[PDB]
Amino acid sequence: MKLFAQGTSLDLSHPHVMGILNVTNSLIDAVKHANLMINAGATIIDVGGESTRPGAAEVSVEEELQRVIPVVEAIAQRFEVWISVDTSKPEVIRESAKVGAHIINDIRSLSEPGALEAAAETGLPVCLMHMQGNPDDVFAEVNRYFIEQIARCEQAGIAKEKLLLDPGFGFGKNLSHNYSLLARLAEFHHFNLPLLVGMSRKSMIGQLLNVGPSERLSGSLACAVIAAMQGAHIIRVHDVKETVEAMRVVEATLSAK
Amino acid sequence: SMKLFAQGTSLDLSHPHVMGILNVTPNSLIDAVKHANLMINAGATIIDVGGEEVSVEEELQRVIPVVEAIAQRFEVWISVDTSKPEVIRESAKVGAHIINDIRSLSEPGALEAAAETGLPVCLMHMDDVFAEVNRYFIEQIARCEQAGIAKEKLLLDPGFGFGKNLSHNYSLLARLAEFHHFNLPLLVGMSRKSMIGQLLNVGPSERLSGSLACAVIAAMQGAHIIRVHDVKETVEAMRVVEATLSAKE
Numbered sequence: 001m002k003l004f005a006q007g008t009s010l011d012l013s014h015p016h017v018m019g020i021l022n023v024t025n026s027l028i029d030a031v032k033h034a035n036l037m038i039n040a041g042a043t044i045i046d047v048g049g050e051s052t053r054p055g056a057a058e059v060s061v062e063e064e065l066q067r068v069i070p071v072v073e074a075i076a077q078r079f080e081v082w083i084s085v086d087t088s089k090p091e092v093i094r095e096s097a098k099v100g101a102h103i104i105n106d107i108r109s110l111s112e113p114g115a116l117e118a119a120a121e122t123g124l125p126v127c128l129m130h131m132q133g134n135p136d137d138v139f140a141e142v143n144r145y146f147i148e149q150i151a152r153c154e155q156a157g158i159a160k161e162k163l164l165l166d167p168g169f170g171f172g173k174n175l176s177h178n179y180s181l182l183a184r185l186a187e188f189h190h191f192n193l194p195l196l197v198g199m200s201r202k203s204m205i206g207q208l209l210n211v212g213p214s215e216r217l218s219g220s221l222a223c224a225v226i227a228a229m230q231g232a233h234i235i236r237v238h239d240v241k242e243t244v245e246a247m248r249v250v251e252a253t254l255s256a257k
Numbered sequence: 258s259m260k261l262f263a264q265g266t267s268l269d270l271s272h273p274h275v276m277g278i279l280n281v282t283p284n285s286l287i288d289a290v291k292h293a294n295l296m297i298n299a300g301a302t303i304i305d306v307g308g309e310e311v312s313v314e315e316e317l318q319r320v321i322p323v324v325e326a327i328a329q330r331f332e333v334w335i336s337v338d339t340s341k342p343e344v345i346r347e348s349a350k351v352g353a354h355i356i357n358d359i360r361s362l363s364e365p366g367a368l369e370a371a372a373e374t375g376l377p378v379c380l381m382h383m384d385d386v387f388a389e390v391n392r393y394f395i396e397q398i399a400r401c402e403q404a405g406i407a408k409e410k411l412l413l414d415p416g417f418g419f420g421k422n423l424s425h426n427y428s429l430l431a432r433l434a435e436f437h438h439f440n441l442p443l444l445v446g447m448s449r450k451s452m453i454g455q456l457l458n459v460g461p462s463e464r465l466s467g468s469l470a471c472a473v474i475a476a477m478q479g480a481h482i483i484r485v486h487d488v489k490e491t492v493e494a495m496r497v498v499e500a501t502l503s504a505k506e
């Protein structure tokens with residue numbers, strides 16, 4: 001399985017680590033953090049602001065363009081690494097593609113006005129995430145959501161092969177819902193689409209272990225390994241070095257299988 | 258549910274347990290108890306005492322006082338790393354729960370000593386590595402049964418490392434769940450080993466992420482006991498595994 005963007009491809013025959021680059025001189029700092037993550041083994045750099053954390057300050061289109069576009073450009077000028085952009089705004093989707101973004105990572109699944117059209121115009125891969133807010137058990141709910149959103153994307157001219165699916169760990173989901181989704185993650189392979197997951201330092205680790213946000217590495221690695229053994233294709237994390245190390249062990253095991 | 262029984266207590270293996278490594282090889286006693294205490298507080302539910310071939314009198318001197326001290330002070334289960342009948346016998350007398358013999362009771366008198374104790378025994382394996390290990394287990398289970406050790410006293414360990422090469426180690430890890438056909442506890446030890454070091458290219462003190470990854474892969478396949486150096490982090494990883502397996506209804 002492969003993804004295609006900007007005339008290049010990403011080989012999803014093994015898990016990839018996507019490193020989180022939060023950009024909320026900031027530019028020079030962002031490039032150096034990206035370099036560190038690439039050196040540690042990240043093969044996708046995920047560029048975004050603070051505003052995707054629940055509770056965080058909302059920002060203008062103007063501020064998002066000012067913060068994200070130059071960082072995407074600076075990475076494309078320095079590195080061959082794939083670049084994902086965390087945005088829900090159609091103008092950021094449009095402008096990010098123009099400076100070399102490979103993946104549109106919208107936790108709102110292109111629900112904001114004009115986002116669906118902008119994404120379609122770029123022809124880029126798009127990650128669709130389940131969230132409560134976005135326009136029986138929790139697996140079935142998320143599975144139904146994916147069916148619906150895949151349909152919506154396709155109706156707008158976005159080929160299925162451009163889509164990635166993310167069951168959306170966290171974002172207010174309680175402990176049992178999060179672990180149900182992780183336990184059943186492999187069942188989402190029935191769509192034959194890349195699975196992207198993000199559990200790094202989230203509540204499902206913090207609340208389970210009763211530890212603060214800086215004390216969640218071991219739990220985060222365990223989540224990553226559990227997902228990757230179930231064939232998750234991209235793992236979005238804060239701690240790239242350690243996750244990549246864990247993925248080496250996963251890859252050795254799946255190879256032996 | 259799978260349980261083990263020893264010294265008038267039981268070990269419930271319906272969830273993974275972390276067994277902390279306690280190397281006594283050379284006061285030494287005071288430091289051994291302190292380390293044991295730290296690992297217990299970090300969530301180890303078995304402490305694995307080993308002091309190593311050294312003479313049997315050396316081994317008795319190193320190991321027995323430590324087992325005895327831990328048994329007197331704590332309620333934690335204790336496993337003893339030994340191949341020698343005298344140490345098996347004396348360990349049992351001072352409160353040990355599991356005989357952990359990497360040589361699977363092959364040394365003279367070991368089998369009889371193990372049977373006489375009535376304690377749980379861990380059997381470790383030392384073209385088709387899965388089939389060879391599986392056949393080994395079949396043979397050793399029969400050997401133990403013949404000596405009067407009930408099958409329900411046995412634990413099986415495929416013996417990661419010990420000169421098995423990288424490919425063989427990962428074949429065994431990938432297929433670990435297939436050893437459940439014996440209906441016996443699976444014990445595994447991958448912590449800080451070369452099967453991690455060779456892949457990560459980091460020294461023994463830098464291998465935690467790989468050690469945790471091995472531990473999680475094994476536990477998601479139903480391994481019952483994970484033998485490790487780094488207890489607190491492994492215990493955390495196991496809670497995440499338990500939350501996942503529990504959610505699988």
Ligand SMILES: CNc1nc(N)[nH]c(=O)c1N=O
Pocket residue numbers: 048052086105106107127129166168169196197198199236
């Ligand atoms: C932009 N942030 C995220 N993106 C995706 N796709 N999935 C997450 O869990 C996530 N969590 O923060």
Ligand SMILES: CNc1nc(N)[nH]c(=O)c1N=O
Pocket residue numbers: 307338357359379381414416417444445446447484
């Ligand atoms: C005493 N040492 C060990 N014991 C067991 N059962 N398994 C190991 O891998 C091991 N590795 O060192």
Ligand code: NA
Pocket residue numbers: 238239240
């Ligand atoms: Na870090």
Ligand code: NA
Pocket residue numbers: 486487488
């Ligand atoms: Na440690």
